[PDB]
Amino acid sequence: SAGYTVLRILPLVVLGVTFVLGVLGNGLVIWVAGFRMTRTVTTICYLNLALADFSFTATLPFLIVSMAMGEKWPFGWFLCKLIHIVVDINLFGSVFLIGFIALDRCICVLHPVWAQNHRTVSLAMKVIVGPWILALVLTLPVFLFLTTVTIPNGDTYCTFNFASWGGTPEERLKVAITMLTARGIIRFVIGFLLPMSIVAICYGLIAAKIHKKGMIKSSRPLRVLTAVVASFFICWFPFQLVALLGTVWLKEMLFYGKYKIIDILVNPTSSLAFFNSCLNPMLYVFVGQDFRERLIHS
């Protein structure tokens, strides 16, 4: 169909512009903030987010060329493992860093005394590397349960395989379905519900406090807050919703395939999530006046 062909071609250009914008913005942010001004907790968070997004978009063309040919992976097993692990770690870390920046801003607004006294650089590094540990923990199934699988037709797709762990087709299928359900539940809860609740509450309390105490001398702060919240929602909610719908109905998809709309709907939602990842440097870092001044002076 003409519409389906467009629906498949569009994610390619979406990830292409995503890769270009993400690499450019993350490189500029790293070079400016991480090398040409003093270290700050907000600066540390910005560098963490920029590094996560840059490492994600660095491996983006591999995913682009993989989905350009119906999810076939032209490269080897080791490269597929490395790219998938890096992408998953970077995505989880980026979402956790968004949540952490929301929490840090909420702490700085609600309790400025604690931020003035108990918010230091070393503590910031420890509590900023903690989310990376959480991302690695959540990526551990990708570390273990991912291998390259070649279909009899000759095409290769490096997806989750369970022949070694199970040893019995019924047991292998049961382990596969239960691990996939657990992964989907973990993604939905920790990946989406945990940060989105944090981001909505943290930015909501900042808006509530700034309105009550009357620091709103212009519409720009409210516009920035609503832009952050709306971008994060409209980008991640479709992807997590599609993933949850696929996981809850995964038995039907694997056995019969009643809900085939999810298979073709994953790609645009993943494209939009990647677009969120690439626009994060513009939405979070470029808003500040000091960074813009440093960039134009550069």
């Binding site: 989750f160 992807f239 993943s270």
Partner: peptide, 5 residues
């Protein structure tokens, strides 16, 4: 994160 089946 990625929905890989």
């Amino acid at each position: 994160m990625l929905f890989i089946i």
